[PDB]
């Protein structure tokens, strides 16, 4: 659970 979060984050931005 945490690393699913930890390991997707840095991609979050792209579509902003």
């Given at each position: 659970?945490a690393?699913?979060?930890?390991?997707?984050?840095?991609?979050?931005?792209?579509?902003?």
């Amino acid at each position: 659970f945490a690393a699913a979060x930890g390991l997707a984050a840095p991609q979050x931005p792209a579509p902003f």
